[PDB]
Amino acid sequence: QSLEESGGDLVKPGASLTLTCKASGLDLPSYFMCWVRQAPGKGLEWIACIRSSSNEILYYASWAKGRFTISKTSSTTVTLQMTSLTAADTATYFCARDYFGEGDVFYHGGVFGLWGSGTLVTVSSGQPKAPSVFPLAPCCGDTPSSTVTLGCLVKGYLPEPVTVTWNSGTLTNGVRTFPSVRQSSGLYSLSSVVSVTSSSQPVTCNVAHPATNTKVDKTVAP
Amino acid sequence: VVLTQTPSSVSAAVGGSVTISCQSSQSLYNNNRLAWYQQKAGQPPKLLIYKASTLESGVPSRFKGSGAGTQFTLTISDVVCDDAATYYCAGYKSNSDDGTAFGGGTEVVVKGDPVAPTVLIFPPAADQVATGTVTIVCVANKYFPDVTVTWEVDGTTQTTGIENSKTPQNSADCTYNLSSTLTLTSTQYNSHKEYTCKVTQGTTSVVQSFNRGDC
Ligand SMILES: CC(=O)N[C@H]1[C@H](O[C@H]2[C@@H](O)[C@@H](CO)O[C@@H](O[C@H]3[C@H](O)[C@@H](O)[C@H](OC[C@@H]4O[C@@H](C(O)O)[C@H](O)[C@@H]4O[C@@H]4O[C@H](CO)[C@H](O)[C@H](O[C@]5(C(=O)O)C[C@H](O)[C@@H](NC(C)=O)[C@H]([C@H](O)[C@H](O)CO)O5)[C@H]4O)O[C@@H]3CO)[C@@H]2O)O[C@H](CO[C@@H]2O[C@H](CO)[C@@H](O[C@@H]3O[C@H](CO)[C@H](O)[C@H](O)[C@H]3O)[C@H](O)[C@H]2O)[C@@H](O[C@@H]2O[C@H](CO)[C@H](O)[C@H](O[C@]3(C(=O)O)C[C@H](O)[C@@H](NC(C)=O)[C@H]([C@H](O)[C@H](O)CO)O3)[C@H]2O)[C@@H]1O
Structure with missing residues (x-):
């Protein structure tokens, strides 16, 4: 079924x-x-x-x-x-x-x-557009803490949808993926963040966009 | 057939009760072909009640269907945080034009116990400025009730370039999360220095800030 x-x-x-x-x-x-x-x-x-x-x-x-x-x-x-x-x-x-x-x-x-x-x-x-992906990390003049929030900014894509996973769907806990928002121009932007305990090694966000057959992988460091 | 669902929006405390009312323009087939659905973001609707009052398998007794003919109600008792969702009535008259209809929808907001937000600001990656436009992200975590957001650059408030987006309520603890972005040209970004994100929850506020090139 x-x-x-x-x-x-x-x-x-x-x-x-x-x-x-x-x-x-x-x-x-x-x-x-x-x-x-x-x-x-x-x-x-x-x-x-x-x-x-x-x-x-x-x-x-x-x-x-x-x-x-x-x-x-x-x-x-x-x-x-x-x-x-x-x-x-x-x-x-x-x-x-x-x-x-x-x-x-x-x-x-x-x-x-x-x-x-x-x-x-x-x-x-509109013409289709794959997303520019950027890492989201805290400002580098801050003191490294026990836990840390890192993310991916998925900017300026068309059409919907995009799908965001972390470490190929193994890292599920701590993950907060926000709804897309349309710009004035027509393109969509979207954010996903995740919380982890520093010593654990590096978080990768996997951004699929089947509309353009584009699948981005971005590793993020503090 | 047209279904008139009411209210469009309702708030309820945990352990309280919600009451949703459907009203059809014509009698439904056998005076009982109305069904209730639960929908959450990213998923198709779950079937809760059918034939006006029969519970689908796996659905708690907490959901009650009642009514007959043109007037139908869903009552949710002992409201948990997992019940925060959008609910829909669906009615049928006959195998003919407009024979099946969906109600407009009702958003159930569950009043969980309040929490203030923690705030993170995210300066733009080095990559962004090179592309001409730059966007700055600000997130607000584990909070209830709702918040507004204000952006300053060199202490002066911002009107345009802003976009907010909010997570559904958490099924465990009823909190929202929010992301807000501020978008600027690279010439605007490389002019100013002090960039601020101010979240506000009625009385409480949480400002978070960074200086350009403190890096
Ligand atoms: C389900 C249902 O619906 N149920 C219901 C019922 O119904 C029924 C009916 O309709 C009948 C009649 O006729 O019919 C039936 O049907 C059927 C049957 O059943 C079966 O069996 C059959 O089938 C089978 C067969 O077998 C075999 C042979 O044998 O061989 C075969 O197999 C066959 O088969 C088949 O085949 C075919 C081919 O040919 C086909 O295929 C089919 O399929 C089909 C098609 O066609 O396609 C499918 C589909 O799907 C379908 N469709 C639809 C739409 O669905 C179809 C169809 O069905 C068909 O076609 C048709 O034809 O199909 C296959 O199947 O079959 C048959 C058929 O027909 C049924 O079952 O009913 C009951 C009751 O109700 C009611 O009520 C009302 C009132 O309101 C009344 O009215 C009145 O009356 C009086 C006098 O007496 C005066 O006059 C007045 O004016 C009026 O108004 C009536 O009468 C009645 O009857 C019901 O129950 C109910 O429920 C509800 C729930 O919700 C409720 O509870 C109720 O309650 C009350 C009432 O009553 O209403 C409410 C109210 O409100 C109250 N009140 C106050 C509160 O105040 C009341 C009180 O409580 C009391 O009164 C005390 O005393 O209550 C109840 O009742 C049921 O549900």
Whole structure:
């Protein structure tokens, strides 16, 4: 049981784009499979559901029908064909299963128990940009302490997302990765810090940006 | 169908109670197809309650669903810090246009016991000035309740070039963390000397500072 959604580079307004949802350890046609979306810092918005087997049932949101098309391309995949995309269509697009059980019987109706992680679609005229990464350390005239807070500044990237780990995901404790913030220009910046006991040896932050296929590694010293 | 979720925002003390109300424009299918969700940053929504009142497996009795027809409520009792999140109602009428809808959302802020922030300032790496623009980072750790931030350069307050970002509440202790950045041209940075970051939590303040090239 996993849904893994895929699709969507950064795209220019006017363009079309197709998302896919692959299903692992579960067959899609017998359940109502839907697409939902969430714009940055905004609420959930239902788009459409489909059940492929028996009598084929489709239904859409009023703002979706005519522009977006939901369909089934296999027994483990459902698609969303988007068209005439605008900047307001920038969101994370989830894929979910509308279903609940009650003994010998199946039902459905706004009951989304199973969701995929999402696939960020970004509609913008801007050109993609990999992040400049800089180390964050305390000023060098300070006295070395027992513990120390060090970080990475991930500056000026597009589109979202970037992912920050530390020592390839082994160093988890003490880690504080802040939400991205958009500039006036359109680029995103982001910070991640971590606390460690001096004598432990050196912290490396790993900054992935799958949009540009860039993956930076930065080692930080006090 | 349209769901009207209320309130949009609510605060609650630990061990207190929260009450969220959904109101649908039309009767829902069988007078009971409303579900409640919990969402935290970076994750998809978790299903808490379905069919208006059935608990999903693994969800505590602390979450109660009630209502029928057009009016539905979620009550969270004995509020823990892990309950700090955004909650959503989701309703269904029928297999037709606008048949399923999500409510606007409610943000649950949990009043944990107050903590003052420690402040770190981070001067720009040597790399930055060479790129023309330079940005200076200031972080505020393990704190509650919220803070504002002020930037000075040579004792004069700053209006532009500023960007703040705040962590969700900690699921263990209810504290925020905040990062604030100040951005300048290299000619602005290489003119002035004393660079300051002033965090404020009502009465308490924490200034943190550094002089350019004390390095
Ligand atoms: C789940 C649910 O919902 N449940 C619910 C119920 O329901 C039900 C109903 O609906 C019925 C009717 O008909 O139906 C059913 O259905 C079903 C069944 O069940 C089953 O079994 C079947 O199936 C199976 C089968 O088997 C086999 C054979 O045999 O062979 C087969 O297998 C089959 O199968 C199937 O197949 C097909 C093909 O062909 C298909 O496939 C299907 O699938 C499907 C499709 O189609 O697709 C899937 C999907 O998903 C679905 N959909 C959906 C949407 O879901 C579908 C569908 O379903 C279908 O199609 C349809 O057709 O499917 C497969 O499956 O099947 C069947 C079908 O039908 C069910 O179950 O109910 C109950 C009750 O309620 C109610 O109430 C109301 C009131 O409000 C009333 O009203 C009234 O009335 C009166 C008179 O009497 C007067 O007149 C008035 O005016 C009115 O108004 C009514 O009557 C009633 O009934 C319910 O319960 C409830 O619950 C809730 C919770 O939330 C609550 O608790 C309640 O309570 C109350 C009430 O009552 O309401 C509330 C209130 O408020 C109160 N009050 C105060 C507070 O004040 C009250 C009080 O308390 C009292 O009164 C005291 O006394 O309470 C309760 O009740 C349940 O839940």
